Amino acid sequence: PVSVQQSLAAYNQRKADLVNRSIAQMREATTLANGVLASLNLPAAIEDVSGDTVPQSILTKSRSVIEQGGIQTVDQLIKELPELLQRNREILDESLRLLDEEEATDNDLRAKFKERWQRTPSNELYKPLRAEGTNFRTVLDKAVQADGQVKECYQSHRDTIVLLCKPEPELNAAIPSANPAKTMQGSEVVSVLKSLLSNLDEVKKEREGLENDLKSVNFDMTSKFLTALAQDGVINEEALSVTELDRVYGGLTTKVQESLKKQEGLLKNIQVSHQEFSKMKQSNNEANLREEVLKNLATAYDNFVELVANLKEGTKFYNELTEILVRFQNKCSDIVFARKTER
Numbered sequence: 001p002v003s004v005q006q007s008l009a010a011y012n013q014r015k016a017d018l019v020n021r022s023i024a025q026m027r028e029a030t031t032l033a034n035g036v037l038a039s040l041n042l043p044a045a046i047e048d049v050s051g052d053t054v055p056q057s058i059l060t061k062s063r064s065v066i067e068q069g070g071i072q073t074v075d076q077l078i079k080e081l082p083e084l085l086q087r088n089r090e091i092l093d094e095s096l097r098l099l100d101e102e103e104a105t106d107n108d109l110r111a112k113f114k115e116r117w118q119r120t121p122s123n124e125l126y127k128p129l130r131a132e133g134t135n136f137r138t139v140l141d142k143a144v145q146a147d148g149q150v151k152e153c154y155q156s157h158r159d160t161i162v163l164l165c166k167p168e169p170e171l172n173a174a175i176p177s178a179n180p181a182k183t184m185q186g187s188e189v190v191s192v193l194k195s196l197l198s199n200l201d202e203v204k205k206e207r208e209g210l211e212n213d214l215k216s217v218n219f220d221m222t223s224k225f226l227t228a229l230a231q232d233g234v235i236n237e238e239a240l241s242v243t244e245l246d247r248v249y250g251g252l253t254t255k256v257q258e259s260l261k262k263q264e265g266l267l268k269n270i271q272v273s274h275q276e277f278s279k280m281k282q283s284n285n286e287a288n289l290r291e292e293v294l295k296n297l298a299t300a301y302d303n304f305v306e307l308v309a310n311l312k313e314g315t316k317f318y319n320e321l322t323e324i325l326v327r328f329q330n331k332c333s334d335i336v337f338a339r340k341t342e343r
Helices: 004-039 042-049 057-069 071-112 128-155 188-216 222-229 237-277 286-340
Strands: none
Touching: 004 188, 004 222, 042 188, 042 286, 057 286, 071 128, 071 188, 071 237, 071 286, 128 237, 188 237, 222 237, 222 286
């Protein structure tokens, strides 16, 4: 309660959460937009003015996947995961084998002798280790569950990706060619839509800035903490941190609230606008093919995007988890060493 070192540790904890939480809000909002925006396929069906073909905000989206490497990026990563996770089951399962085994020796030693086997029991001693052990496990299970959720997600969408790596066959398939092109071109309500759609980008973009700006902050409370100790007999970490957390992130916290509760206005004022776009109800047949598809295309893009990250980071994770468990292992085997070497 008067240690600067621990006081610092708290700040990093409190700082990290502030930042993380803030990043998460923005990343979930960006995806929630893309879902809405592709649930109504706006980029696709404004650029559909030239009905015939429509290589538009999707050839765009196809080029960037070709750039990306297509499934050959995904399909490679996905197959790689179970091995990584198996590595991790194993390290944990050994650590606990080591433990279960000495413990069993110990248990029969006090059984055979009694008084004369007077050390403190492995029962009791490895209770923390086990506690620790079972959390790793919790992590794994949830990791398996999340990894399951992924395998369905791409598995399902995959069809709609393979078809997005074509330069001219793209038409003959993707394009149903509905003949729907309306003289309803760049009319008043179609331009108010383009800007309201490109505003959302200037919104989409700044979120990188906001994110990076948030991570780039480093403050260092040491001086602040020492001075509180040398003025009062104590350190009141919560109060010191809160007050300096606002001074340092409060200006980036509003920019976060002001990116979110601005998206609110931009969202609900299009649900309306997109209906005020189709009170002309086009054609419930050929344009169906023209419609539902474009709606099913941007989701194939959006979902691909969110699919590399999940993967890339599940990987990153797994290898950090590993370097964590190994440490766990060693600790178990050290403690085990301590017991044979004991007395």
